[PDB]
Amino acid sequence: MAPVTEKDLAEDAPWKKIQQNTFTRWCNEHLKCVNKRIGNLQTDLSDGLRLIALLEVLSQKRMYRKYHQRPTFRQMQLENVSVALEFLDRESIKLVSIDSKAIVDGNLKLILGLVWTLILHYSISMPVWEDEKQTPKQRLLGWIQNKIPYLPITNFNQNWQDGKALGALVDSCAPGLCPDWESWDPQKPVDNAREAMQQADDWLGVPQVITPEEIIHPDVDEHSVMTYLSQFPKAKL
Template identity: 55%
Template sequence: MQRRERMAFDDEMEQMLTAGTQPDAGWKIIQQNTFTRWVNQQLKSADVSITDLETDFEDGLKLIRLVEVLSGRSLGKYSKKVAFRSQKLENNALVLNFLENEEHIKIVNIDSSAIVDRNLKLILGLVWTLVLHYSIAQQIWELPEDSEKVVERSPKEKLMLWIRGKLPDDINLKNFTSDWNSGILLGALVDSCAPDLHIGWRSWDPADALQSTRIAMDVAEKHLSVVPLITAEELINPAVDEKSIMTYLAQFPQARYKPPIGFIENEGTGHAVVGQRCEFKLNTISESILVDVLVNDPDGKFVDVVVAKEAPQLYSIQYFPRMEGRYAMTLKLREATGEDSLELFVETMVVAAEYRFTYNEVAQVGKPVMFSLENAGDGVTEV
């Protein structure tokens, strides 16, 4: 890091670690869960895992392995069979010294005894130091700013700038806490990274935050390989802190989009009316994709569906609603080889008994008026 970037990093680290060592609050459980998942994600390649941040670093062995994985370097000799407190202190001191002297990471408010004595607040602070350095600060950033200004920004500012650059102009990102509670911002971010999935985030209701967040996180995991380091329930919790959210969001700048094996071309045509055909199109990436379609009426009962193959990679899907209300549609696609699968949720269709419209143009007495009816279906339509 250059000197200005190092100063910005150190200042941000000190401020955020100080905030993270305040008396217990609702954020602490969420943060502990998120950091535990992050640690396990890093340790996956080493075939090692932890279950409790408070105790699992006590002997220093798993912390040593974690730092070796993150840094890509060996920490040298250490006590592998730990029986005494002195050995625990030595192992943890080895890690902290390596981070400060070799990786040039400023360690704040923690020494080896804090880890051995299971000081959870300080251990969380140490893990955040690792997250901030290895998952955020060391990333290669493509930011909508002049390159000479980028190095002067803190890791938090860089992540904020990158996300703002991905979001539509009418979406205002102000923080890494409450802005993410509704699921809408996450939906917008996922949509910008995977635009041809059309997840429909603009129609999401903040009152349905949990469902919206689950959909966005599921798409991010399947198509961007963004690991759910935080749960949807935790992300929409008003108590969630910015470290937990940043830990999750820090995966997006390096995410690589994996296109779906199929996508909806149009979700319904015009207005759905009882007794009239409702149709939409499904495109697949190959002829070998197998398609299953489920449609449930407002009572939850299955509706008969007609699936017709119009072209090698194009399907027409039709159903005839027999009652008013909300119809839920799900498409399940899978490769014939069984290598890949996808589940698409078509936006809920509201079916009406009849459809009325208002003619907004100026009409003159005695002169014909031309208009067209979409989704009229087969047979006679009453007007």
């Protein structure tokens, strides 16, 4: 329908789709156990109901405020989201610039911001990681570095681009899954990433919340990669 300009493409950098995609799959992995799912992150949290459901699963606590089970009107949706945001505030989960109308009105930047807050808190900062003062990002880097001691791991973008670090991580978790990772061709990144991540999925129970084509994308963002890699320190330790 509408023409796509050079500016349109530049202003919708490829990481934005990758991050939205990855954050959505992460949400869906946590919502599956309550028989819910998100098709579109921009719209599907806006009445508050799926956000409330997600918060209960993540926190393992129930809402203590009444809310609207059939939030047909804007004011009901605002109240539902406000319950969700108070819940986070009172759990000392720091949010910045996120208010109720941002979520109700499909402000995608702020919605992604909120979902990242949840990932960083519940999947990166909080969990118990065995076998291995410090930001959540540093914690995850440290855990990963201990698993693959022969590669310098300092970031969640360029270090993963050739797909071999993925091989190294998966084999270190279970030697025999990706034993020949060091002899892999760095110029075959999609092949490398797919093999490693499918092995991790099939054997180590690690869901592909980011895809092989996404994780090696030259413009991939660190938050998307962190979301995926934070899954490893559960058991594989």
